[PDB]
């Protein structure tokens, strides 16, 4: 066999085996951005009631579900290596798991420029000066030249503090400083 390039995330499952085998063929020949723009439009053209039907319907055949898809991917835009991918998903019966392969590929291609975003879950949204200060100290923490994305969630069960995660780091300044008052009891 030949060797294959390793993705920087390395997820597992029956959907990770198809997002890795495409990443080992599109990192070769330098086509990692052409497939991504194609894959974000094949997600749109599957979820139509003419086409979402008779792909999960088990009583058609294997071969005529290929021919109804071998011309659909040929006429509109595509003749890359990715036309073999839809041809291979329909042979193995794995055409149902096609949103699983696409959604895995975006995060596998995200990490080529992405940052595994944060989670600040404290309270109601605050003023602008508090937001820009955390966005300009977390930029000092990545040290990788990548413009970090972030999400904010509202959870009032934390009393007055906030929890912050950077990837897989998870600092903590929250109501667990009230649970640290067992030193008055357990001593």
């Amino acid at each position: 066999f030949a060797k294959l390039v390793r993705p920087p995330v390395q997820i597992y499952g029956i959907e990770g085996r198809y997002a890795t085998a495409l990443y080992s063929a599109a990192s070769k020949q330098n086509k990692l951005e052409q497939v991504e723009k194609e894959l974000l439009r094949v997600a749109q053209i599957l979820k139509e009631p003419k086409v979402a039907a008779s792909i999960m319907n088990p009583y058609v055949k294997r071969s005529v579900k290929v021919k109804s898809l071998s011309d659909m991917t040929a006429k509109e835009k595509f003749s890359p290596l990715t036309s073999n991918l839809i041809n291979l998903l329909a042979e193995n019966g794995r055409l149902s798991s096609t949103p699983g392969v696409i959604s895995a590929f975006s995060t596998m291609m995200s990490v080529h420029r992405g940052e595994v975003p944060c989670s600040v879950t404290t309270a109601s949204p605050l003023d602008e000066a508090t937001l820009t200060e955390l966005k300009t100290v977390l930029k000092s923490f990545l040290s990788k030249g990548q413009i970090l994305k972030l999400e904010v969630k509202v959870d009032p069960s934390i009393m007055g503090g906030m929890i912050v995660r950077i990837g897989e780091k998870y600092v903590d300044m929250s109501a667990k400083t009230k649970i640290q008052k067992l030193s008055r009891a357990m001593r």
Binding site: R17, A21, L22, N84, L88
Partner: protein, 501 residues
């Protein structure tokens, strides 16, 4: 549901264009290896039970065809194989070299020499997975196959085409019956009557390698390696090489049977084959049964011992005799394997481990040894005398100062000591019929029991010399007439007057 060939090394061949410089019709790769079988991807024109060849030089059998892969049973060790190899398709069912030009060699189970005498020089190849002959071509046995042992040839007679078991515990004299059968054929293979010639095959399964080597000397010492083949898969060989050892051994005997010759094969032993088929079955995750055996152990030994048959006169007239060996654990003749083979073969021979300790050798249990179809095919000279000894060995067995008890307890011990025999001394047929004559006609009833092994070695050594031309009419005419037994009365009663007590 994850698929064997859903791995990324095979999806990449498909997702990067359907590649042209891979064959995928006569050659394939190896995906995994280590439990015996290998998972070969490709090879889309392979047959079932077709021998393939690895890149290391190992043969392998195509056992199990699937829509993704092929499962190849590997002959020999599986250290030499690596994931990512390339396996070639031979194009033929598993077959072995066979012919007249093998008499005198020591091969392994695949048909390669391991005696260091160069190639074999064969021209024909027969398969190992052929079927037995049907109901029409067979016929009942009629020619006798001599053994040279005084306990076997007169109490459980064998015939050319009859299966016969040899069953006993360890170190009871199992192999030493099978060796004296091969040395006894020296008198027939070196003669002019071609209709009585008989070849031999020995199959050694799971034995030690240093016990086969001390066996081929003993055959060469007695001029018995010029009509004998030996197949050998010893205890250090892999498990598929012990499973396919009796099939390649029987396919070399099927050549002589279909071409008018008579053969003989000794499997030694079929116990260690069934513990090798157990290993390949449980390593394929099959449901075990009694004693953790697979469900088709009966198919293993029936499809092998059904080939040993005798063809009719319109098919050539040859034969094939088998003599398998089963080892029991402490006299257990009610276990799973020694009952699957009693319900196949046409009789038994029992070797007791508690008569081998008392000094009776060969320790043949005369009560439990039977031979059904081979009783009608024996010499009328032997049937005229051994039909009487069958009666007195029965009357000795019920009585185990009274009247009608101390008469049979006297004769019944002189016939037990008459049936002892030294190692590697195969007697002829017409020399047996004089020694069994003196023990059943009532001549040695007066002697002491300890001085009767001395008596047989003195009477035979002289009548072979001074009455040699008068003994040949027993073997030539094949019977004891009214002139021979009146002549035989004077030979013994003149020798007892000269035999110093």
């Amino acid at each position: 549901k994850t698929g064997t060939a859903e791995v990324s090394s095979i999806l990449e061949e498909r997702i990067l264009g359907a590649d042209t410089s891979v064959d995928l019709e006569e050659t394939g790769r190896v995906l995994s290896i280590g439990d015996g079988i290998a998972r070969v991807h490709g090879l889309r024109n392979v047959q079932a039970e077709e021998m393939v060849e690895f890149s290391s030089g190992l043969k392998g059998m195509s056992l199990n065809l699937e829509p993704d892969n092929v499962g190849v049973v590997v002959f020999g060790n599986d250290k030499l194989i690596k994931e990512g190899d390339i396996v070639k398709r031979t194009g033929a069912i598993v077959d072995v070299p066979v012919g007249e030009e093998l008499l005198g060699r020591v091969v392994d189970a695949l048909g390669n020499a391991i005696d260091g005498k160069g190639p074999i020089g064969s021209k024909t190849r027969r398969r190992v997975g052929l079927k037995a002959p049907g109901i029409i071509p067979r016929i009942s046995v009629r020619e006798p196959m001599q053994t040279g042992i005084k306990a076997v040839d007169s109490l459980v007679p064998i015939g050319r085409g009859q299966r016969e078991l040899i069953i006993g515990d360890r170190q009871t004299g199992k192999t030493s019956i099978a060796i004296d059968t091969i040395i006894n054929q020296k008198r027939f293979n070196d003669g002019t009557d071609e209709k009585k010639k008989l070849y031999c095959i020995y199959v050694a399964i799971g034995q030690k390698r240093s016990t086969v080597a001390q066996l081929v000397k003993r055959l060469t010492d007695a001029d018995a390696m010029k009509y004998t083949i030996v197949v050998s898969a010893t205890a250090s060989d892999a498990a598929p090489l012990q499973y396919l050892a009796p099939y390649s051994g029987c396919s070399m005997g099927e050549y002589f049977r279909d071409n008018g010759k008579h053969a003989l094969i000794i499997y030694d032993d079929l116990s260690k084959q069934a513990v090798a088929y157990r290993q390949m079955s449980l390593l394929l995750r099959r449901p075990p049964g009694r004693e953790a055996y697979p469900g088709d152990v009966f198919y293993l030994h029936s499809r092998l011992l059904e080939r040993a048959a005798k063809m009719n006169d319109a098919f050539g007239g040859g034969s094939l005799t088998a003599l398998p060996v089963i080892e029991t654990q402490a006299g257990d003749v009610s276990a799973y394997i020694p009952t699957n083979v009693i319900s196949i073969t046409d009789g038994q021979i029992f070797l007791e481990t508690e008569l081998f300790y008392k000094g009776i050798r060969p320790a043949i249990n005369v009560g439990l040894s039977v031979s059904r179809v081979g009783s009608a095919a024996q010499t009328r000279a032997m049937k005229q005398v051994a039909g009487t000894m069958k009666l007195e060995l029965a009357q000795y067995r019920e009585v185990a100062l009274d009247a009608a008890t101390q008469q049979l307890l006297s004769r019944g011990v002189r016939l037990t000591e008459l049936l002892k025999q030294g190692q590697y001394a195969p007697m002829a047929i017409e020399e047996q019929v004089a020694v069994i004559y003196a023990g059943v006609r009532g001549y040695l009833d007066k002697l002491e029991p300890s001085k009767i092994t001395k008596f047989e070695n003195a009477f035979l050594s002289h009548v072979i010399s001074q009455h040699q031309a008068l003994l040949g009419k027993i073997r030539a005419d094949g019977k004891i007439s009214e002139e021979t037994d009146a002549k035989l009365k004077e030979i013994v009663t003149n020798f007892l007057a000269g035999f110093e007590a």
